[PDB]
Coordinates of C-alpha atoms and ligand atoms in Angstrom, one line a residue:
Chain A
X14 CA 109.2 99.9 144.6
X15 CA 105.9 98.1 144.5
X16 CA 105.4 96.1 141.3
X17 CA 102.0 94.8 140.3
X18 CA 101.6 92.2 137.6
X19 CA 98.1 91.8 136.1
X20 CA 96.9 88.6 134.4
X21 CA 99.6 86.8 136.4
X22 CA 98.0 83.4 136.1
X23 CA 97.8 83.4 132.3
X24 CA 100.5 81.8 130.1
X25 CA 102.9 84.8 130.0
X26 CA 102.0 85.9 133.5
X27 CA 103.0 82.5 134.9
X28 CA 106.4 82.8 133.3
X29 CA 107.0 86.3 134.6
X30 CA 105.8 85.4 138.1
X31 CA 107.9 82.3 138.3
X32 CA 111.0 84.2 137.1
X33 CA 110.3 87.1 139.6
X34 CA 110.0 84.5 142.5
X35 CA 113.2 82.7 141.3
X36 CA 115.1 86.0 141.2
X37 CA 113.6 87.1 144.6
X38 CA 112.3 90.4 143.2
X39 CA 111.2 92.6 146.2
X40 CA 107.7 94.0 146.6
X41 CA 106.2 91.8 143.9
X42 CA 102.4 91.8 143.7
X43 CA 100.0 89.9 141.4
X44 CA 96.4 90.6 140.5
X45 CA 94.0 87.8 139.8
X46 CA 90.2 87.8 139.2
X47 CA 89.6 85.2 141.9
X48 CA 92.2 84.8 144.6
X49 CA 91.4 81.1 145.2
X50 CA 92.8 80.4 141.8
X51 CA 96.4 81.1 142.8
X52 CA 99.0 78.3 142.5
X53 CA 99.8 76.8 145.9
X54 CA 103.4 77.2 145.1
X55 CA 103.0 81.0 144.9
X56 CA 101.3 81.2 148.3
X57 CA 103.5 83.3 150.6
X58 CA 106.0 84.1 147.9
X59 CA 104.1 87.0 146.3
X60 CA 101.4 89.4 147.4
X61 CA 98.0 88.7 146.0
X62 CA 95.2 91.2 145.1
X63 CA 91.8 90.7 143.5
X64 CA 91.6 92.3 140.1
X65 CA 89.0 92.0 137.4
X66 CA 89.9 93.6 134.0
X67 CA 86.3 94.6 133.4
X68 CA 85.6 96.0 136.8
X69 CA 87.1 99.5 137.0
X70 CA 86.6 99.7 140.8
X71 CA 88.6 96.5 141.4
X72 CA 91.5 97.9 139.4
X73 CA 91.5 101.2 141.2
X74 CA 91.7 99.4 144.6
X75 CA 94.3 96.8 143.3
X76 CA 96.6 99.6 142.2
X77 CA 96.6 101.5 145.5
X78 CA 100.2 101.9 146.6
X79 CA 101.6 100.4 143.4
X80 CA 104.5 102.1 141.7
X81 CA 104.9 100.1 138.5
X82 CA 102.1 98.1 136.9
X83 CA 102.9 95.4 134.3
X84 CA 99.8 94.9 132.2
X85 CA 99.1 91.8 130.2
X86 CA 96.2 92.1 127.7
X87 CA 93.4 89.6 127.9
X88 CA 92.3 87.3 125.1
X89 CA 88.9 88.8 124.7
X90 CA 87.8 89.5 121.1
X91 CA 87.0 91.5 119.0
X92 CA 88.8 94.7 119.7
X93 CA 85.6 96.6 120.8
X94 CA 85.1 94.1 123.6
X95 CA 88.7 94.3 124.8
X96 CA 89.2 98.1 124.7
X97 CA 87.5 98.6 128.1
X98 CA 90.4 96.9 129.9
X99 CA 92.9 99.5 128.7
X100 CA 90.5 102.3 129.6
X101 CA 90.3 100.8 133.1
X102 CA 94.1 100.4 133.2
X103 CA 94.7 104.1 132.6
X104 CA 91.8 105.2 134.8
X105 CA 93.0 103.1 137.7
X106 CA 96.6 104.1 137.2
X107 CA 95.7 107.8 137.3
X108 CA 93.3 107.4 140.3
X109 CA 95.8 105.4 142.4
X110 CA 98.9 107.4 141.5
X111 CA 100.7 104.7 139.6
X112 CA 104.0 106.2 138.2
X113 CA 104.9 103.7 135.6
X114 CA 103.1 101.2 133.3
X115 CA 104.8 98.4 131.4
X116 CA 102.3 97.4 128.7
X117 CA 102.8 94.1 126.9
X118 CA 101.6 94.6 123.3
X119 CA 101.5 92.4 120.2
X120 CA 103.5 93.4 117.1
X121 CA 100.6 93.1 114.7
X122 CA 99.6 96.7 115.3
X123 CA 100.4 98.7 112.1
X124 CA 97.8 101.1 110.8
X125 CA 97.2 98.7 107.9
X126 CA 97.5 95.4 109.8
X127 CA 94.4 93.2 109.0
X128 CA 94.7 91.2 112.2
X129 CA 91.4 91.5 114.0
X130 CA 93.1 92.7 117.2
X131 CA 95.2 95.4 115.6
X132 CA 92.7 98.1 116.5
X133 CA 93.0 97.3 120.2
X134 CA 96.8 97.5 120.1
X135 CA 96.8 100.7 118.1
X136 CA 94.3 102.2 120.6
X137 CA 96.2 101.0 123.7
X138 CA 99.5 102.5 122.6
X139 CA 97.8 105.9 121.8
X140 CA 95.7 105.9 125.0
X141 CA 98.9 105.4 127.1
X142 CA 100.4 108.3 125.2
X143 CA 97.5 110.6 126.0
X144 CA 97.4 109.6 129.7
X145 CA 100.5 111.5 130.7
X146 CA 101.7 108.5 132.7
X147 CA 105.2 107.2 132.1
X148 CA 105.0 103.9 130.2
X149 CA 107.2 101.3 128.6
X150 CA 105.5 99.8 125.6
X151 CA 106.9 96.3 124.9
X152 CA 105.8 94.8 121.6
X153 CA 106.2 91.0 121.3
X154 CA 106.4 88.7 118.3
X155 CA 104.3 85.6 117.7
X156 CA 104.4 82.8 120.4
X157 CA 106.4 79.7 119.6
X158 CA 104.7 77.8 122.3
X159 CA 101.5 76.9 120.4
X160 CA 103.5 74.9 117.9
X161 CA 104.3 72.2 120.4
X162 CA 100.6 71.1 121.1
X163 CA 99.9 71.6 117.4
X164 CA 102.5 69.0 116.3
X165 CA 100.0 66.1 116.7
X166 CA 97.6 67.6 114.3
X167 CA 100.4 68.7 111.9
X168 CA 102.0 65.2 111.9
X169 CA 98.5 63.8 111.2
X170 CA 97.8 66.1 108.2
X171 CA 101.4 66.0 107.0
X172 CA 100.8 69.6 106.1
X173 CA 101.3 73.1 107.5
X174 CA 98.2 75.0 106.3
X175 CA 98.5 78.5 107.6
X176 CA 97.2 81.0 104.9
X177 CA 100.4 83.1 105.1
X178 CA 101.4 83.1 101.5
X179 CA 105.1 83.5 101.1
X180 CA 105.4 85.9 104.1
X181 CA 108.0 85.7 106.8
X182 CA 106.7 85.6 110.4
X183 CA 108.9 86.3 113.4
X184 CA 108.5 84.0 116.4
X185 CA 109.6 84.1 120.1
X186 CA 109.0 81.9 123.1
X187 CA 106.9 83.2 126.1
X188 CA 109.8 82.3 128.3
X189 CA 112.0 84.8 126.3
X190 CA 109.3 87.5 126.3
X191 CA 109.2 87.1 130.1
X192 CA 113.0 87.3 130.4
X193 CA 112.9 90.6 128.6
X194 CA 110.1 92.0 130.7
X195 CA 111.9 90.9 133.9
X196 CA 115.0 92.6 132.7
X197 CA 113.0 95.8 132.1
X198 CA 111.4 95.7 135.5
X199 CA 114.8 95.3 137.2
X200 CA 116.5 98.3 135.4
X201 CA 114.6 101.6 135.6
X202 CA 117.0 103.1 133.1
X203 CA 115.1 101.2 130.4
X204 CA 111.8 102.6 131.3
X205 CA 109.9 105.1 129.0
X206 CA 111.2 103.5 125.8
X207 CA 109.5 101.4 123.2
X208 CA 110.7 97.8 122.7
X209 CA 110.2 94.9 120.3
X210 CA 111.0 91.5 121.7
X211 CA 111.6 89.3 118.6
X212 CA 113.1 85.9 118.2
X213 CA 113.6 84.6 114.6
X214 CA 111.8 84.9 111.4
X215 CA 110.8 82.0 109.2
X216 CA 108.7 81.8 106.0
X217 CA 106.2 78.9 106.2
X218 CA 108.4 76.7 104.0
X219 CA 111.3 77.0 106.6
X220 CA 108.8 76.5 109.4
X221 CA 107.5 73.2 108.0
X222 CA 111.0 72.0 107.6
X223 CA 111.8 72.8 111.3
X224 CA 108.6 71.0 112.3
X225 CA 109.3 68.1 110.1
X226 CA 112.8 67.3 111.6
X227 CA 111.5 67.9 115.1
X228 CA 108.6 65.5 114.8
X229 CA 110.5 63.2 112.5
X230 CA 107.4 63.3 110.3
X231 CA 107.2 64.8 106.8
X232 CA 105.3 68.1 106.9
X233 CA 105.0 70.2 103.8
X234 CA 103.7 73.8 103.5
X235 CA 100.3 73.6 101.6
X236 CA 98.3 76.6 102.7
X237 CA 94.5 76.4 102.5
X238 CA 92.2 79.4 101.8
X239 CA 91.5 82.0 104.4
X240 CA 87.9 80.9 104.5
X241 CA 88.7 77.2 104.8
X242 CA 91.2 78.0 107.6
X243 CA 88.7 80.1 109.5
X244 CA 85.9 77.5 109.0
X245 CA 87.9 74.5 110.2
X246 CA 89.1 76.3 113.3
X247 CA 86.1 78.5 114.2
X248 CA 86.0 77.7 117.9
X249 CA 84.8 79.6 119.7
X250 CA 82.6 81.4 117.2
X251 CA 84.3 84.3 115.5
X252 CA 87.8 82.9 116.4
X253 CA 88.2 81.4 113.0
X254 CA 88.2 84.6 111.1
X255 CA 90.5 86.2 113.7
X256 CA 93.1 83.5 113.6
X257 CA 93.0 83.6 109.8
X258 CA 93.5 87.3 109.8
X259 CA 96.7 86.9 111.8
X260 CA 98.3 84.7 109.1
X261 CA 96.8 87.1 106.4
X262 CA 98.8 89.8 108.1
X263 CA 101.9 87.6 107.7
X264 CA 101.1 87.1 104.0
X265 CA 101.3 90.8 103.6
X266 CA 104.7 90.8 105.2
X267 CA 103.6 92.7 108.2
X268 CA 105.0 90.1 110.7
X269 CA 108.6 90.1 109.5
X270 CA 109.7 92.4 112.3
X271 CA 113.1 92.1 114.1
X272 CA 115.2 94.0 116.7
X273 CA 118.1 93.2 118.9
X274 CA 116.2 94.5 122.0
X275 CA 116.2 91.1 123.6
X276 CA 120.0 90.8 123.4
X277 CA 120.5 94.4 124.7
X278 CA 118.1 93.8 127.7
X279 CA 118.9 90.2 128.6
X280 CA 122.5 90.1 127.2
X281 CA 121.8 86.8 125.4
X282 CA 120.3 85.5 122.1
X283 CA 116.7 84.3 122.0
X284 CA 116.0 80.6 121.9
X285 CA 115.6 79.2 118.4
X286 CA 112.6 77.2 117.4
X287 CA 114.7 74.1 116.9
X288 CA 116.0 74.4 120.4
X289 CA 112.5 75.0 121.8
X290 CA 110.9 72.0 120.0
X291 CA 113.9 69.8 120.9
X292 CA 113.5 70.8 124.6
Chain B
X27 CA 77.6 104.6 91.4
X28 CA 75.8 105.9 94.5
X29 CA 77.9 108.2 96.8
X30 CA 76.9 109.0 100.3
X31 CA 78.6 111.8 102.3
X32 CA 77.9 111.6 106.1
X33 CA 78.0 114.7 108.3
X34 CA 77.4 116.8 105.2
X35 CA 76.0 119.8 107.2
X36 CA 79.2 120.2 109.3
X37 CA 81.9 122.8 108.5
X38 CA 84.0 120.4 106.3
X39 CA 80.9 118.6 105.0
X40 CA 79.4 121.8 103.7
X41 CA 82.5 122.5 101.7
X42 CA 82.5 119.1 100.2
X43 CA 78.8 119.1 99.4
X44 CA 78.9 122.5 97.7
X45 CA 81.9 121.5 95.7
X46 CA 80.2 118.3 94.7
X47 CA 77.2 120.3 93.5
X48 CA 79.5 122.7 91.6
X49 CA 81.3 119.7 89.9
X50 CA 77.9 118.2 89.0
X51 CA 78.6 114.9 90.8
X52 CA 75.5 112.7 90.2
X53 CA 74.0 110.1 92.5
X54 CA 75.2 112.2 95.5
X55 CA 73.4 111.5 98.8
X56 CA 74.0 113.0 102.2
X57 CA 73.4 111.6 105.7
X58 CA 72.6 114.1 108.4
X59 CA 71.3 114.0 111.9
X60 CA 69.0 117.0 111.4
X61 CA 67.5 117.3 107.9
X62 CA 66.1 120.7 108.9
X63 CA 69.6 122.1 108.8
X64 CA 70.0 121.4 105.1
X65 CA 70.5 124.4 102.9
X66 CA 67.5 125.1 100.6
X67 CA 69.8 125.4 97.6
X68 CA 70.7 121.7 98.1
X69 CA 67.1 120.6 97.4
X70 CA 67.0 118.7 94.1
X71 CA 70.8 118.5 93.9
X72 CA 71.5 115.8 96.5
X73 CA 69.3 113.2 98.1
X74 CA 68.9 113.6 101.9
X75 CA 68.7 110.8 104.4
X76 CA 68.6 111.1 108.2
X77 CA 71.3 109.4 110.2
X78 CA 72.5 109.0 113.7
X79 CA 76.2 107.8 114.0
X80 CA 75.5 106.2 117.3
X81 CA 72.5 104.1 116.2
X82 CA 73.6 101.1 114.3
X83 CA 70.3 100.5 112.5
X84 CA 70.2 104.2 111.5
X85 CA 73.5 103.7 109.8
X86 CA 72.4 100.4 108.2
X87 CA 69.3 102.0 106.8
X88 CA 71.1 105.0 105.5
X89 CA 73.7 102.9 103.6
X90 CA 71.1 100.7 101.8
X91 CA 71.7 101.2 98.1
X92 CA 74.9 103.1 98.5
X93 CA 78.2 102.1 96.8
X94 CA 80.7 104.6 98.3
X95 CA 80.5 106.2 101.7
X96 CA 82.6 109.3 102.5
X97 CA 82.7 109.4 106.3
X98 CA 83.4 112.5 108.3
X99 CA 84.0 111.7 112.0
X100 CA 82.0 113.5 114.7
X101 CA 83.5 115.7 117.4
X102 CA 82.4 113.5 120.3
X103 CA 85.1 113.0 123.0
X104 CA 86.9 111.3 124.5
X105 CA 88.0 108.4 122.2
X106 CA 86.1 105.7 124.0
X107 CA 82.8 107.6 123.4
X108 CA 83.5 108.1 119.7
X109 CA 84.6 104.6 118.8
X110 CA 81.1 103.2 118.3
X111 CA 81.0 105.6 115.3
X112 CA 83.5 103.6 113.3
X113 CA 82.2 100.3 114.5
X114 CA 78.8 101.3 113.1
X115 CA 80.3 102.5 109.9
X116 CA 81.9 99.1 109.2
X117 CA 78.9 97.1 110.4
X118 CA 76.5 99.1 108.3
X119 CA 78.8 99.0 105.2
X120 CA 78.9 95.2 105.4
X121 CA 75.2 94.8 106.2
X122 CA 74.0 97.1 103.4
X123 CA 76.6 96.2 100.8
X124 CA 78.7 99.3 100.6
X125 CA 81.7 98.6 98.4
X126 CA 84.0 101.4 99.3
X127 CA 84.6 103.7 102.2
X128 CA 86.5 107.0 102.0
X129 CA 87.4 107.9 105.6
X130 CA 88.4 111.4 106.5
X131 CA 90.8 111.2 109.5
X132 CA 93.0 113.7 111.3
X133 CA 96.8 113.6 111.1
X134 CA 97.5 113.6 114.8
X135 CA 97.4 109.8 114.9
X136 CA 100.9 108.4 115.5
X137 CA 101.4 105.6 118.1
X138 CA 103.0 108.2 120.4
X139 CA 100.8 111.2 119.7
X140 CA 99.4 112.8 122.9
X141 CA 96.4 114.3 121.2
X142 CA 93.3 113.0 123.1
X143 CA 91.7 111.8 120.0
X144 CA 94.7 109.9 118.6
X145 CA 93.3 106.5 120.0
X146 CA 90.1 107.0 117.9
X147 CA 92.0 107.6 114.7
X148 CA 94.5 104.8 115.3
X149 CA 91.6 102.5 116.0
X150 CA 89.6 103.7 113.0
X151 CA 92.4 103.1 110.5
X152 CA 93.0 99.6 111.8
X153 CA 89.4 98.6 112.0
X154 CA 89.0 99.5 108.4
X155 CA 92.0 97.3 107.6
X156 CA 90.4 94.4 109.5
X157 CA 87.0 94.8 107.9
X158 CA 87.9 93.5 104.4
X159 CA 86.1 96.4 102.8
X160 CA 87.9 98.4 100.2
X161 CA 88.8 101.8 101.6
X162 CA 90.7 105.1 101.1
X163 CA 92.1 106.7 104.2
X164 CA 92.5 110.4 103.9
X165 CA 94.4 112.2 106.6
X166 CA 94.1 116.0 107.0
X167 CA 96.3 118.6 108.6
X168 CA 95.1 121.3 111.0
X169 CA 92.3 123.7 109.8
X170 CA 93.3 127.2 109.1
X171 CA 89.7 128.4 109.3
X172 CA 89.5 128.7 113.1
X173 CA 92.2 131.4 113.1
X174 CA 89.9 134.0 111.6
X175 CA 87.2 134.1 114.4
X176 CA 90.1 133.8 116.9
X177 CA 92.0 136.9 115.7
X178 CA 89.8 139.3 117.9
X179 CA 91.0 137.6 121.1
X180 CA 94.6 137.3 119.8
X181 CA 94.6 141.0 119.0
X182 CA 93.4 141.8 122.5
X183 CA 96.1 139.8 124.3
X184 CA 98.6 140.9 121.6
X185 CA 100.0 137.4 122.0
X186 CA 99.7 133.9 120.5
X187 CA 99.5 131.5 123.4
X188 CA 99.3 128.0 121.9
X189 CA 101.5 125.7 124.1
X190 CA 103.3 124.3 121.1
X191 CA 106.9 125.1 122.1
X192 CA 109.2 125.6 119.1
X193 CA 107.3 123.0 117.1
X194 CA 106.1 123.5 113.5
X195 CA 102.4 122.7 112.8
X196 CA 101.1 122.0 109.3
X197 CA 97.9 123.9 108.4
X198 CA 95.4 123.7 105.5
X199 CA 92.0 125.3 104.7
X200 CA 88.8 123.3 104.8
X201 CA 88.3 124.5 101.2
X202 CA 91.6 122.8 100.2
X203 CA 90.8 119.6 102.1
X204 CA 87.4 119.5 100.3
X205 CA 89.1 120.0 97.0
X206 CA 91.4 117.0 97.6
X207 CA 88.5 114.8 98.8
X208 CA 86.4 115.8 95.7
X209 CA 89.3 115.0 93.4
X210 CA 89.5 111.5 95.0
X211 CA 85.8 110.9 94.7
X212 CA 85.8 111.9 91.0
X213 CA 88.6 109.5 90.1
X214 CA 88.2 105.9 91.3
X215 CA 91.8 105.2 90.2
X216 CA 92.9 107.1 93.3
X217 CA 91.0 104.8 95.6
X218 CA 92.6 102.3 98.0
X219 CA 95.5 104.4 98.9
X220 CA 96.5 106.4 102.0
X221 CA 96.7 110.2 101.6
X222 CA 97.8 113.2 103.6
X223 CA 96.3 116.5 102.6
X224 CA 98.8 119.1 103.9
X225 CA 99.1 122.8 103.3
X226 CA 102.0 124.7 105.0
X227 CA 104.0 124.2 108.2
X228 CA 104.5 127.2 110.4
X229 CA 106.3 127.4 113.7
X230 CA 104.4 129.5 116.2
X231 CA 106.7 132.5 115.6
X232 CA 105.9 132.7 111.9
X233 CA 102.2 132.2 112.7
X234 CA 102.3 135.2 115.0
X235 CA 104.1 137.3 112.4
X236 CA 101.5 136.3 109.8
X237 CA 98.5 137.2 112.1
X238 CA 100.3 140.4 113.1
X239 CA 100.7 141.8 109.6
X240 CA 97.2 140.5 108.6
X241 CA 95.6 142.1 111.6
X242 CA 97.7 145.2 111.6
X243 CA 98.3 144.8 115.3
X244 CA 101.3 143.4 117.1
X245 CA 100.9 139.8 118.2
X246 CA 103.9 138.0 119.7
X247 CA 104.3 134.3 120.5
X248 CA 104.1 134.0 124.3
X249 CA 102.8 130.4 125.0
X250 CA 101.1 129.8 128.2
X251 CA 101.3 126.6 130.2
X252 CA 99.3 123.5 129.2
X253 CA 97.2 123.8 132.4
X254 CA 96.4 127.5 131.8
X255 CA 95.4 126.9 128.1
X256 CA 93.1 124.1 129.0
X257 CA 91.5 126.2 131.8
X258 CA 90.8 129.2 129.7
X259 CA 89.3 127.1 126.9
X260 CA 87.6 124.2 128.7
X261 CA 84.2 124.4 127.1
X262 CA 82.5 122.0 126.9
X263 CA 84.0 120.1 129.9
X264 CA 87.0 118.1 128.9
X265 CA 87.6 120.0 125.7
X266 CA 90.2 122.2 127.4
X267 CA 92.7 119.4 128.0
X268 CA 91.9 118.0 124.6
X269 CA 92.8 121.2 122.8
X270 CA 95.9 121.6 124.9
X271 CA 97.0 118.1 124.0
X272 CA 96.7 119.0 120.3
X273 CA 99.2 121.8 120.6
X274 CA 101.3 119.6 122.9
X275 CA 101.6 117.1 120.1
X276 CA 102.9 120.1 118.0
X277 CA 105.5 120.8 120.7
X278 CA 106.8 117.3 120.1
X279 CA 107.1 117.9 116.4
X280 CA 104.4 115.4 115.5
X281 CA 102.3 117.9 113.5
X282 CA 105.0 118.9 111.0
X283 CA 103.7 116.5 108.4
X284 CA 103.8 117.2 104.7
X285 CA 103.0 115.3 101.4
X286 CA 102.7 116.2 97.8
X287 CA 99.2 114.5 97.6
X288 CA 97.3 117.7 97.4
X289 CA 99.3 119.0 94.4
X290 CA 99.1 115.6 92.7
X291 CA 95.4 115.3 93.3
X292 CA 94.2 118.8 92.6
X293 CA 97.0 119.9 90.3
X294 CA 97.4 123.2 92.2
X295 CA 99.2 124.8 95.2
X296 CA 97.4 124.9 98.6
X297 CA 96.3 128.3 99.8
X298 CA 98.7 130.0 102.2
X299 CA 97.5 131.4 105.5
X300 CA 98.4 134.9 104.3
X301 CA 96.2 134.5 101.3
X302 CA 93.4 132.9 103.3
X303 CA 93.3 135.8 105.8
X304 CA 93.6 138.3 102.9
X305 CA 90.3 136.9 101.5
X306 CA 88.5 139.7 103.2
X307 CA 89.5 142.8 105.1
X308 CA 89.5 141.9 108.8
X309 CA 86.9 143.6 111.0
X310 CA 88.8 146.0 113.2
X311 CA 87.5 146.7 116.8
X312 CA 87.6 150.4 116.0
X313 CA 85.7 152.6 113.5
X314 CA 87.1 153.8 110.2
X315 CA 84.6 156.3 109.0
Ligands
MG30 MG1 88.8 83.4 136.5
MG31 MG1 108.4 110.2 135.4

């Protein structure tokens, strides 16, 4: 069974690829926009194919002979600019006879979720449904990973300023999301179902406490306005409002989502934020 | 408070506009692609502006001075081709200062709904949410109206062929959808909420029985394959599979959706299919002199 992982060199893709190599998964292929940008450590361990998300032809060719495609959305924004990649995914899958698609989606996708990328995720799930192709839709919670590099700034401000009100947000590490996806890949009896890979939920007060003990510095939750947040983090342009909208969704309580899918798939509990930061 | 209804000359739009005129709604404007298709009786009762959904500046211009926009989606397909519609709606609403948007969406919009236009409706709802503009999302069930002009063919085959399996599909007249929309427009206290305008759910067996006693001819439910249905109704190109996907969603039980919103909004019961067809004696293919 030929597996094709797109966006393999991105953050999540790197975790999935390294785990697939470590587990010696057979017939594993990766797609990258420019083949020269493949880690030397992967050379000879995985099959490489050129694949550009915004070049329909490249995806049609990259999918030839593939049985299962694991698709990782890009970071392009806003939703209108990202939509073409999912259109290309479905077009290429149909053209090249792909039998199964594992789509990695984000959990901020409700009909009333204000996160700027929610339209893309709502559209993707539905487009897959209309395609007639078997698909496993894996929704993931918010990445824990970004918190580590953010510590320096947090310790400096001595304040957690996410405009998330009193909402509870569920977090999970990329490593764990990857463990779930690999488990799905290895067991076809899990295909065709909808999953939510969640870790643990924390309100911002509890988050600040976890960050405080981890950094040994005192960090208190003192949220700034949505406008102030967007304005001080608007880089690149338009990113500010988008990031703010994500926490705004949390304030509305739309990010307090949990399931035991991780445990049922990996037969283990997700790594806690304390363990992650301590690591 | 200036109200603007887009796509006013369409089937549903005509119902809404005539009802708005009957209810004496003032400050009522309409946005149409072809002003020459506007009924003469509408002259002096509503203000007419020309609009092209797929031309951003056309939408921006049409929305200048408007406070509430009631948007009726086009029939363009597939989803990727219709999307620009909602993008322009939001862009123009912001640019021209529209304070509220009443969006008329279709109920075949769940995350797992196979209907070809589900991506568009899922995208539209979410885009409105991300816009920051106040809005009222009105979802409608399946139109009963198309059944009348279709009877002739059904009578000929003596069979209802919708590939909907044993699923139940909720139906409602355009007249009733319009009454619900008008009720919302007239009372701003109903704004900002999500509504479902439903009528009655019928499995295909009951639908056939209704059409049979209404037509006077025997019509049994003998559904054809999804491929066959798309083939005998593929006009324009692509529409065939789209129509089939709609009934396929019904086969999965995704179209049996009901709510009490119509009754709570209009303070009345929706019109049944039997009543709708009984509106006028059906034209028989034979003479009765
Ligand atoms: Mg590159
Ligand atoms: Mg299959």
